[PDB]
Amino acid sequence: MASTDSEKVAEYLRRATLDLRAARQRIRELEGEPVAVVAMACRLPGGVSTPEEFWELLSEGRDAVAGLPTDRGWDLDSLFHPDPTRSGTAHQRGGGFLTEATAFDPAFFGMSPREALAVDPQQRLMLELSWEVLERAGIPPTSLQASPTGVFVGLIPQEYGPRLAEGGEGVEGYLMTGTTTSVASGRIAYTLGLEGPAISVDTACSSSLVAVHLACQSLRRGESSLAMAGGVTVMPTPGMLVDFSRMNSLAPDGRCKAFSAGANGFGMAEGAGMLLLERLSDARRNGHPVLAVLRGTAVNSDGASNGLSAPNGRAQVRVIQQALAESGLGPADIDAVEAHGTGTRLGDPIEARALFEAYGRDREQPLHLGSVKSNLGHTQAAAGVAGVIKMVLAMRAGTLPRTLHASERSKEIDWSSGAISLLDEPEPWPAGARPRRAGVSSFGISGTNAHAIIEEAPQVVEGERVEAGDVVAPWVLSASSAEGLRAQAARLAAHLREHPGQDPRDIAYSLATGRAALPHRAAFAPVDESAALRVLDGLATGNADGAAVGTSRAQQRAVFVFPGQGWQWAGMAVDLLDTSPVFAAALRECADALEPHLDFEVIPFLRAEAARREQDAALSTERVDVVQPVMFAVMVSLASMWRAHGVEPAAVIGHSQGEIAAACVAGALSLDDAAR
Amino acid sequence: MASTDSEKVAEYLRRATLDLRAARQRIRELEGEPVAVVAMACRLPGGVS
């Protein structure tokens, strides 16, 4: 324009670049945006009901293949016969089986004691997990109503009760809508109120990583701001270990001896698992916990294999390389791999030869090859989300857990490159300078390989840090049953006798803004954590002393009732303004609205006790010319206090002069108006 | 010289714009690339095959 020969075009270039910088950051936020694992809930066998118990099975190298379930009353009798071709016999004589299958809380989830008998245990556990995964990600499970949030559940349709053409007595129309894989992801979105893509995918034993991949690819784009991605296989009938045994694919002892010379086949188990997932710059902007980031995912069918159940050796290399070129990484960044490790004698040699071809390509540091199934059992459709719970507790515990049955590494694989180090021992895995990434791979019977690359959470240096000790807030307990509320203060009590000195403000933040406002409420404001621990033990027995118990029906709607006269004491709020500036300042606006209409101000009145109010020209109560405005000022400041603490009235009603305060707080009369 | 900054900072603007015209038609193909229906097979109620 004027100076030199550039003052205008160099503004359109600045803009064409900050538009190119902001349009090529939109391409990397739509196909490669990290998807944070906001929380993980899992009902894996071995009594595992939560990942902390799960970090307590992998770390001690405990196998969870105990035996067949007798809690459902199976016909194990016939599941076994010397002749192994009997049409109804099973070869797995063990396996990882949970007792949480024949167990559910119908009343909590709003289903009748007849609609729930029909509820397929796969869905039944998924409903319980959907509530937990939220209750441990912070997000109140009842706060996600009409919120875009996809439920992506992976399920191998399994057969529960009477055939749909042989309807029961109470279970009849609800036998198809409680068992259709359709309504496992759908029951969740209904009970939780979610309005997002509630898709129940089915890709055999990769339906958890496919559901995780289908949720990550539903997030990178944006159709659901949040997403619950996971999968469950709880096997109601012994109909899967009696068919898988008919193709002689099972092991006679139920162990998935991954990458081991004793490999017999799958050690088929049953389990669940759910991940709460959100775009990494949506779980940092909302403060949600970020446990690990799912960098990239890939799904790749085996193609024309040598059998439907037969694995492809060059369709896994193209899925370990699609998830490795969609995450923007390379084969040398992934420290460890949670491989399928089915324990098969022709699927493990093919898996690992696909792992020396996509990862073990001149590896400077050996790949730590490990398998949750070994410690657990082929979790079928829950395997792949039980590998992103294993390799997300491996992120956050600084340790690669064991592969429990692989000391005698199989002789059908070539472990000569020294590029893969099967995890026969707990390998330390601390936070170094290079990000800690892992790979979880689930390949299925249908021939749909899936591979997901996990990375450790971006090191949060400060985040929500410490300020100062001060007034303590109520410990907010609530449950949907009077016997479940005793169990809440029988599990928070333990979560503090196991973890003592836990900041009270932190047990009143993730209990109040971390849980749902369920009917049976027992909040309590505790001076100390032992005062608390005391009330916690009292509520375990139902004895409320120091605890504010109550009952509700999702009630809300408080009413500010305003007494006219007779509620004054000699020291009304003497320290209520000395402890918080939300009452002192609340008094300040009333005072400056009372100064032009009153001489003596309210500030020194409630500041001083009656024993010291006798010398400030303001009697304790008899001065109706002074205490009536004081009453109104105390009243309005207190009402503003409850409003500042989130207590808003559905109605204000005043008695005689509390009418003035009610009008002041209702908005019909200004602060100065009602003050005058 | 190159017509100082008249034929240069305007030569970099036909790249930073022609790259913006190709980094925005990648976003219109990552979100709204219209997919075809190349063929349709149906076995539906009745004689439909």
Epitope: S3, E7, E11, Y12, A16 | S6, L13, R14
Partner: antibody, heavy 118, light 114 residues
């Protein structure tokens, strides 16, 4: 983000001195050439002036309507643009904006309502 | 001299219907670089003016894809592919060839059409 948040409106009598501050946070303040566009109540935008970048000289170009009256400055270490409005008359009752471009107005800020009434 | 730019000052838009504001310049805004020096600004009613288009056809980031840009050296056009309830206001055709520009133009007074 870039946010050009402004401050400094108010009520004065014709012939006063008023300050208009443009807080720039999100971009390198010294690269752009901030400008101040006036919009009298309910009519079209009129451009008051703009300071060139410190690297472009810092020459300040003003309008014909306000030459010898207004002066515009900028600071990087304190990262603020200034419209120094001296000898105001009745015309300055308006919503003054701060855009981040001499020929390519960008963020525009928010809108500082300045009023010059007697 | 100065570039005099005019437009359909009182253009009505009905929601969901493509609309088209046009600009006509007396002089030629196609500078030698082959880049037009016309910009399209939007002042939404009672808000800070927005930059919709720079260099005639290029759209600023953060601006809805609806606003499309085109034009020769004299006649120009803004093609809103989809007018919604935020697409209403004043559309200023503002040149860049001859800075300084004391005015942003009369601006196209856009209205929801009935």
């Amino acid at each position: 983000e870039v946010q050009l948040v402004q401050s400094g409106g108010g009520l004065v009598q014709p012939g006063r001195s008023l300050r208009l501050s443009c807080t720039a946070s999100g971009f390198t303040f010294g690269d752009y050439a901030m400008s101040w566009v006036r919009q009298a109540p309910g009519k079209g935008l009129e451009w008051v002036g703009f300071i060139r970048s410190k690297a472009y000289g810092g020459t300040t170009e003003y309008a014909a309507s306000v030459k010898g009256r207004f002066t515009i400055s900028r600071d990087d270490s304190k990262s603020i643009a200034y419209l120094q409005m001296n000898s105001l008359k009745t015309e300055d009752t308006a919503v003054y904006y701060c855009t981040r471009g001499g020929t390519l107005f960008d963020y525009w800020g928010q809108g500082t309502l300045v009023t010059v009434s007697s | 001299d100065v570039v005099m730019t005019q437009s359909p000052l009182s253009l009505p838009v009905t929601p969901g219907e493509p609309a088209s504001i046009s600009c006509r310049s007396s002089q030629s805004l196609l500078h030698s670089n082959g880049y037009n020096y016309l910009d399209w600004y939007l002042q939404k009613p009672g808000q800070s003016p927005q930059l919709l288009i720079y260099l005639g056809s290029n759209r600023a980031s953060g601006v809805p894809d609806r606003f499309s840009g085109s034009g020769s050296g004299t006649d120009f056009t803004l093609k809103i592919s989809r007018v919604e309830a935020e697409d209403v206001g004043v559309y200023y055709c503002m040149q860049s060839l001859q800075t300084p520009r004391l005015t942003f133009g009369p601006g196209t007074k856009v209205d929801i059409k009935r």
